[PDB]
Structure 1
Amino acid sequence: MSLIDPRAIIDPSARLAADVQVGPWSIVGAEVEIGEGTVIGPHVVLKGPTKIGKHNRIYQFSSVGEDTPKYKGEPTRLVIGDHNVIREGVTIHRGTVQDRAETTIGDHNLIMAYAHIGHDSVIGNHCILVNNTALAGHVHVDDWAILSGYTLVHQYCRIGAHSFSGMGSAIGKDVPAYVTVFGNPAEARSMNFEGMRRRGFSSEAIHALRRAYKVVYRQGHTVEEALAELAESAAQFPEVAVFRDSIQSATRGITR
């Protein structure tokens, strides 16, 4: 009946909205802030400084807000947005504040059982990290990306918007927006046309993206050559600009 179970431990410094639910044997640690409509299951460990937004769901056996591995006492933070689902056994680490490297998760994400979000990672909105996906640290996952079960992501990799990885992919380089990748080591296969159609992209945009993939991957061009050729299409289609920008911001080279 009581929203906060009497068997839960709520640190005196934690700040909760009035309707937050916390299950039995859960720990809401010092410096944890939890927003309206959030439901914390039983057996959850929350550590701070962490901000959890509204209408989130965190399942049993999760450890959210764990320590970042420059100096002792350096402020760190984890920020989670709204309408996220964090399934059982998920581990999420905090990130450093002063260098703008906090760990941050946006809205409407689904982080499935035993997934791992390493320190300083940034997840956008509407992403899906399937069971046991592991982000080593400093990984950027843009909107609508889907990482299938047991995908591994090397530190500093960028996962483009609407990209997709096959199960067991081992990502060591950047994944451009819309690109589908598979295997260990991951290799580019195609584009996520299915995702584009579900998102309501025009047939013209999809056609421009199919041509864009060919320019980058099938016409023997260098990254510099491909970027120069994409400028025109990118200026005309915002979806092609999303693709072009992801190749431009690749620091680890692109997955091929």
Structure 2
Amino acid sequence: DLIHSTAIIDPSAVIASDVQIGPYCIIGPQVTIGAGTKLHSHVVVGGFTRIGQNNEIFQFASVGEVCQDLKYKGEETWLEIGNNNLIREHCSLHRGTVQDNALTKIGSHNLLMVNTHIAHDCIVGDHNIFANNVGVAGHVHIGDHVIVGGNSGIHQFCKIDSYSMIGGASLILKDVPAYVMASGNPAHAFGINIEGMRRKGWSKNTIQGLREAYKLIFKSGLTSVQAIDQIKSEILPSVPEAQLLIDSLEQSERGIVR
């Protein structure tokens, strides 16, 4: 049978068609599991979690457990997971806090390798890869097509925007703008994800515009606002892809990694 008899499923849970749940899983209250999702053995879904379609969750993952924030006082909060994600062994995904929006959210087509931690109130987009032992702290926002190298940590409230790459064993304390390669402890920007955007099939002119934008942001001594003005003036009109960089700088709360 698709659901092993030793799984324990709260009466308030709702399980869609063709869901697989292996031995010794625990499904808590107010959990919904979408069609085609597979849980291996030994998965705990704590409660208050909506899981989409065609996910796969491996043994010893702790999914939708209460957060670690000492401010938390038992309020009703949630975790949402989209579709087609891979959540490997030993991951921990925590529910939100009322101080933010009571919601931790992950999108679709993500790979969370062994021991990925997604803290309370994170918002993660689509097509991301978190390598082993990645720790994403509270209220972090991750875009799409991001790669986070193994054993890296992302500090609370940071924003890691689309197509960026974080090198292995990095400590990220500030925002990483769209397309940026950042690495280290301490953690510096090193350039644009040129190979990544070439592999995505982007033109030389587009790439050159983003390289000029990078120089304006990181090498020229300009403030974020000043760099935005230059990108808007000279680069954005022929390189619409530069808008993601502008968005990074406009949306930043912690400042950016340099």
Which band: TM-score by shorter chain?
A: over 0.9
Displacement of 1:201 in angstroms is: 1.9
Partner of 1:84: 85
Report the 3-state secondary structure (helix = DSSP H, G, I; strand = E; otherwise coil) of the residue aligned with 2:236. helix
Q: Does 1:183 align with 2:184?
A: yes
Paired with 2:25 and 2:210, the residues of 1 have a C-alpha distance of: 47
Displacement of 1:101 in angstroms is: 4.6
CA contact (8 A) 2:174 2:256 kept: yes
Partner of 1:60: 59
CA contact (8 A) 2:225 2:249 kept: no
Give structure 1 stretches of 5+ with no counterpart: none
Displacement of 1:98 in angstroms is: 7.8
- The CA RMSD over aligned residues, in Å, is 1.4
Provide Cα deviations, 1:205-251, integer angstroms capped at 9, x if missing partner: 11110111011112222222211101132244331000111011111
Q: Which amino acid aligns with 1:254?
A: I
Q: Does 1:160 align with 2:161?
A: yes
Q: Using a 3 Å threshold, how does the CA distance of structure 1 residues 231 and 166 change in structure 2: closer, same or farther?
A: same
Q: Which amino acid aligns with 2:141?
A: H
Partner of 2:45: 46
Q: Does 1:7 align with 2:6?
A: yes
Equivalenced residues, count: 255
Q: Comparing 106-115 with 92-101, which one deviates more in the overlay? A: 92-101
Partner of 1:196: 197
Q: Using a 3 Å threshold, how does the CA distance of structure 1 residues 163 and 101 change in structure 2: closer, same or farther?
A: farther
Provide Cα deviations, 1:40-66, integer angstroms capped at 9, x if missing partner: 010111112000000000000000001
Summarize the alignment of residues 60-209 of structure 1 with structure 2, pairs less than 5 Å apart. Answer: 60-68=59-67, 69=69, 72-96=73-97, 99-209=100-210
Give structure 2 stretches of 5+ with no counterpart: none
Report the 3-state secondary structure (helix = DSSP H, G, I; strand = E; otherwise coil) of the residue aligned with 2:63. strand
Q: Using a 3 Å threshold, how does the CA distance of structure 1 residues 212 and 101 change in structure 2: closer, same or farther?
A: farther
Paired with 1:150 and 1:98, the residues of 2 have a C-alpha distance of: 28
Q: Which amino acid aligns with 1:130?
A: A
Q: Does 1:234 align with 2:236?
A: yes
Partner of 1:214: 215
Report the 3-state secondary structure (helix = DSSP H, G, I; strand = E; otherwise coil) of the residue aligned with 1:95. coil
Aligned sequence identity (%):
50
Provide Cα deviations, 1:112-164, integer angstroms capped at 9, x if missing partner: 00010000000000001110100111000011010000110100000011000
Question: Which aligned segments of 4 or more residues in structure 1 are displaced greater than 6 angstroms?
Answer: none
Partner of 2:250: 248
